Design a protein around this ligand. Structure first.
Ligand SMILES: [Br-]
Ligand SMILES: [Br-]
Ligand SMILES: [K+]
Ligand SMILES: [K+]
Ligand code: NA
Lengths: 246, 247
């Protein structure tokens, strides 16, 4: 009975005028009560976004650091995120891992601290192309999930996001069947390494290519519980993804 | 054409709306001298907040930015966003970015060029590590860092150079007035030879690394020290005394 979860990752896009407009559109849309919607604005606009967005939509930070305060020029802490009214943080996003070199160890530390501070965490995992081509999809993704799991006590405020990095900007297409396949292996890992209740209740959302015209078939997959949306989250079509299970 | 005394407050990853609100209230009430250019750099989540609360006389800076205007860079912000929030400066190349988060010289240079193109001022940070100082190659290191910056600066009017020896940052071990003056002298001489005398004479070179209300006066008295980048003490009432260092 897992509640459909749709996250919108705006990445490094937008300004007050365009984002205010995007927010206006989301506020005007009807969001199904059985759908949990979260938007992740650029870090300069967390406060702005929370002020303008309907309380029904939650706000997420796109990243955070692993202690509450300190000499870390350019970083923000979970405490600041909560202070701005945001209730989630995205951690371990492929861009942080593969453009900014964030290690699993660091990601684990961030998860532990964010959860301790009272945030929910959208914890991202995923294998690159070379990893998949070498047949170590499972090794890579189970290892990433284990690091996350080793830093989670209460799974109620965690959502796992599978990013098929091998099929993001590579020329490869991930089929719904390939997505379902990994999601099923991930849920199996939870069942096997945590508990049946956790496996059954934890949302595992898809972070690959999703558009208004692809989301239905993906959402239909039994182990896909929603989406972490990239580019489409900036467009009115995001509303259609929110309404995938309608 | 005298160089205006410049005092930057880098709040780093500290503060919440309540405490930063109180910090800001104190600054607003202090009446900073028109003779001092004051800039505060809040955590990224509070740039908008700080600008809304701070008296217009005080400028706001971001603590970092990325090198393109928009894109698939989860967790980053661009100069355009910074300007949109009403901030007019960005701190680039801070020791913590370089040494905790591994930002390369090349990346910092790309950030400098983009920030300047987008209409921001840049506080460009350089500085040597302890091993480098105990060995005596301070000069080679900071010249190299400065050249990367300079290679990406065509107009110096909105650039401030911040010399922060890494061993002075957060350690309590403030460089002596002599140590700072000696480095600042050389950096100004570098600007003279490699850019122009006009840029050398007009560009603020500020010192940072354990600047406090007790050490600011004597550091400030050095002819080639044009102000400060203040970390820890920018979170304290002391910051007003530093702003008033020349008063
Ligand atoms: Br605090
Ligand atoms: Br500093
Ligand atoms: K499903
Ligand atoms: K001076
Ligand atoms: Na692709």
């Amino acid at each position: 009975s897992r509640k459909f979860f749709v996250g919108g990752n705006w990445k490094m896009n937008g300004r007050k005028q365009s984002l205010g407009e995007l927010i206006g559109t989301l506020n005007a849309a009807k969001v199904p009560a059985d759908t949990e919607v979260v938007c992740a604005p650029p870090t300069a606009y967390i406060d702005f976004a929370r002020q303008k967005l309907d309380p029904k939509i939650a706000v997420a930070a796109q990243n955070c650091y692993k202690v509450t305060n300190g000499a870390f020029t350019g970083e923000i802490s979970p405490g600041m995120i909560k202070d701005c009214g945001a209730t989630w943080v995205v951690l371990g996003h492929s861009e942080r891992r593969h453009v900014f070199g964030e290690s699993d160890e660091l990601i684990g530390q961030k998860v532990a601290h964010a959860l301790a501070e009272g945030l929910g965490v959208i914890a991202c995992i995923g294998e690159k192309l070379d990893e998949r081509e070498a047949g170590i999809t499972e090794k890579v993704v189970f290892e990433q999930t284990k690091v996350i799991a080793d830093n989670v006590k209460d799974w109620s405020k965690v959502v796992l996001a599978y990013e098929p990095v091998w099929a993001i900007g590579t020329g490869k297409t991930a089929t719904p069947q390939q997505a379902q396949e990994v999601h099923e292996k991930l849920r199996g890992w939870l069942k096997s390494n945590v508990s049946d209740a956790v496996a059954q209740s934890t949302r595992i959302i898809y972070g690959g290519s999703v558009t208004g015209a692809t989301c239905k078939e993906l959402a239909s997959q039994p182990d896909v519980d929603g989406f972490l949306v990239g580019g489409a989250s900036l467009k009115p079509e995001f509303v259609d993804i929110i309404n995938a299970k309608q």
